[PDB]
Amino acid sequence: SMNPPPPETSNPNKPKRQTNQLQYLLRVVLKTLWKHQFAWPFQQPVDAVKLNLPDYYKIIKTPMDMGTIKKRLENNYYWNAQECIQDFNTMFTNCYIYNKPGDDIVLMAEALEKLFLQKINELPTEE
C-alpha cells in the first residue's frame, strides 16, 4: 500500500501575507479545534496504509488535515483567510464524502465543524 505525497506546506515562489484574519485563524480557530477531544484523527494526513483504507486516495483527490493547516499557518503559507477557510472546509467535506452517515469519524468532524463555524462567524474585519 502507498500514501500520496502530503499537501504542500512550503513554496518560496508563492506570495505570502501575515494578516489579522490569518492570525485569528491560527490563534482562535486552529487552536480551538486542535485541543478538542475529537481532534486526533485530523491532526495529520490520513495514513491509508496504517489505517487499512486502500480506497481512501482513490476517492479523495484533494486531501487536507489540520497538521497541514497548522504548518501552513505557522509558516505563513497563505495570502488570505479564504484560502485557509477553504482548507478547513475541504478537510470536513473529505470526511463526509469518504465515510458513512453516523460513523464515529463523521460525528467527530461534525463536532469540530460546529466550533469552526462559531469561530469563523466572528472573523475580524481586516486591519
Ligand X SMILES: Cc1nnc2n1-c1sccc1C(c1ccccc1)=NC2
CB atoms inside a 10 Å sphere around CB 112: 24
Q: Indicate which single residue of 25, 26, 30, 46 sits in contact with ligand X (rule: CB under 6 A).
A: 46
Per-residue 3-state assignment (H helix, E strand, C coil) for 10-70: CCCCCCCCCCHHHHHHHHHHHHHHHCCCCCHHHCCCCCCCCCCCCCHHHHCCCCCCHHHHH
Q: Indicate which single residue of 3, 23, 89, 99 sits in contact with ligand X (rule: CB under 6 A).
A: 99
**Could you say whether residue 110 binds ligand X (CB under 6 A)?**
no
**Could you say whether residue 104 binds ligand X (CB under 6 A)?**
yes
Cα(30)–Cα(32) distance, integer angstroms: 5
Give the shortest CB-53-to-ligand X separation in angstroms.
6
Phi and psi dihedrals of 17, rounded to 5?
A: -135, 155
Q: Indicate which single residue of 73, 95, 116, 119 sits in contact with ligand X (rule: CB under 6 A).
A: 95
**Could you say whether residue 51 binds ligand X (CB under 6 A)?**
yes
Give the shortest CB-75-to-ligand X separation in angstroms.
22
Chain residues in the site for ligand X (CB under 6 A): 41-42, 46, 51, 95, 98-99, 104-105
